[PDB]
């Protein structure tokens, strides 16, 4: 060891890292799904297909 | 005379002294609730009778 007291951030909070990566991946797939649905609705309403 | 005194006196120094003096007049309040509400009453009387902000 090095430290005389075990630090709070000596080991990674794996629950919080998992929630972070899962939330970020969810927001990316929801953003890409929203964007594809929006370009499809734009092309449907304006007749560009 | 000019570029250490008078051109220094007329634009920056007199402006700075004026803002200092206005700052000390605005912030010389005695912390009394009585005087602030008396100023609020004088504000309402000037707004109604002297400025006609209610018409």
């Amino acid at each position: 060891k090095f430290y005389i007291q075990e630090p709070p951030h000596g080991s990674p909070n794996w629950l919080k890292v998992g929630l972070t990566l899962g939330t970020s991946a969810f927001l990316w797939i929801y953003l890409i799904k929203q964007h594809n649905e929006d370009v499809l609705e734009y092309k449907r309403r304006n007749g560009l297909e | 005379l000019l570029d250490l005194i008078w051109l220094e006196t007329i634009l920056p120094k007199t402006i700075s002294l004026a803002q200092m003096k206005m700052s000390t007049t605005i912030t010389s309040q005695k912390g009394l609730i009585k005087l602030y509400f008396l100023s609020f009453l004088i504000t309402i009387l000037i707004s109604t009778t002297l400025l006609n902000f209610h018409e």
């Binding site: - | 803002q19 912030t27 609730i33 609020f40 309402i44 902000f53």
Partner: protein, 347 residues
């Protein structure tokens, strides 16, 4: 304070402001203000010392007086209109009384005299609530009654707030009074553009809330309530001096920063309406605000004041304070000017 009781009381502050924002009846506006004042009194008396009791008493007296003037304006509106809809008022006397009452609740000059006292008397988190969240409900009422707001009254209040808030902060060394006079000047800027374009009122309100929340969060993160204790920050946390530097330069409205965004748009809306003298003198008067912001940047970031020996102990301990949204708020308070046309989302 019990944390559950703190959560219920903060939700009640929020509920009072939300009731003001969502209601169509004047009695529910007045109820939202009463609920908000009643719930925010314990937040000011959180630490139980005579300065907090004095600040809460002064706050109670000013907000209760404004609440009675508000109810008299509502009652005169009911005389001359027979109804209670939160819309334009149907009497100029009721319009004057409601504008006075809302200016007292905002602490706009010449009803500004409680804001530095009450802000100084209370902790930094409760002064954060007072200078940001407590502006939201009266500005929303001013938003809805602007077809009946007298122009000369609201512009007199605006320029008087900008000048008095500029000169008031020049004499201050306490950080809470600096933020209070800065608040008075920024509310003057918000009401000056209100009858011309209330979207710019909302823009100035949002940018002010972001920058003021940033400065209060930095002050809480460094435990500093004076200029001279803020000057120790370089020897303890040198990143915090850079953050207070960029945020104070932004609050001065210096481009390319985000606090240049409101006043520019405000001038952009006041010259379309052929008012040229007024935004000119307003912008020149805001140089007073920039002067005492620059005073704080000189003492904190651009020079190194002398420290003490016991500071060496605080080098061995990290900041365990939850600096909630401080990097996000610091980025939004400084780097937002390239996204200036985002303001149309407030329309």
């Amino acid at each position: 304070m019990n944390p559950i009781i703190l959560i219920i009381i903060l939700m009640t502050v929020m509920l009072g402001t939300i009731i003001v924002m969502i209601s169509t009846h004047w009695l529910l506006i007045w109820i939202g203000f009463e609920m908000n004042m009643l719930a925010i009194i314990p937040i000011m008396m959180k630490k139980h010392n005579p300065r907090a009791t004095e600040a809460s008493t002064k706050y109670f007296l000013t907000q209760s007086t404004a609440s009675m003037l508000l109810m008299m304006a509502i009652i005169i509106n009911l005389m001359f209109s027979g109804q209670w809809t939160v819309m334009k008022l149907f009497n100029p006397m009721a319009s004057m009384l409601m504008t006075m009452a809302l200016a007292m609740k905002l602490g706009m000059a010449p009803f500004h005299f409680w804001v530095p006292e009450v802000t100084q008397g209370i902790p930094l988190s409760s002064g954060l609530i007072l200078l940001t969240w407590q502006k939201l409900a009266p500005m929303s009422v001013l938003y809805q009654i602007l077809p009946s707001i007298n122009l000369d009254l609201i512009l007199t209040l605006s320029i008087l707030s900008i000048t008095i808030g500029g000169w008031g902060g020049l004499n201050q060394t306490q950080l809470r009074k600096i933020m209070a006079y800065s608040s008075i000047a920024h509310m003057g800027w918000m009401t000056a553009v209100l009858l011309y374009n209330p979207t710019m009122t909302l823009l100035n309100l949002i940018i002010y809330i972001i920058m003021t929340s940033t400065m209060f969060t930095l002050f809480m993160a460094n435990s500093t309530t004076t200029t001279l204790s803020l000057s120790h920050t370089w020897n303890k946390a040198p990143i915090m001096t850079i953050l207070v530097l960029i945020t104070l330069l932004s609050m001065g409205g210096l481009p390319p920063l985000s606090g240049f965004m409101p006043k520019w748009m405000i001038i952009q809306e006041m010259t379309k309406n052929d008012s040229i003298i007024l935004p000119t003198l307003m912008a020149i008067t805001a140089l007073l605000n920039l002067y005492f912001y620059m005073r704080l940047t000189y003492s904190t970031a651009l020079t190194m004041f002398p420290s003490t020996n016991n500071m060496k102990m605080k080098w061995q301990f990290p900041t365990t304070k939850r600096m909630t949204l401080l990097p996000t708020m610091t980025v939004l308070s400084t780097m937002l000017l390239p996204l200036t046309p985002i303001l149309s989302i407030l329309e």
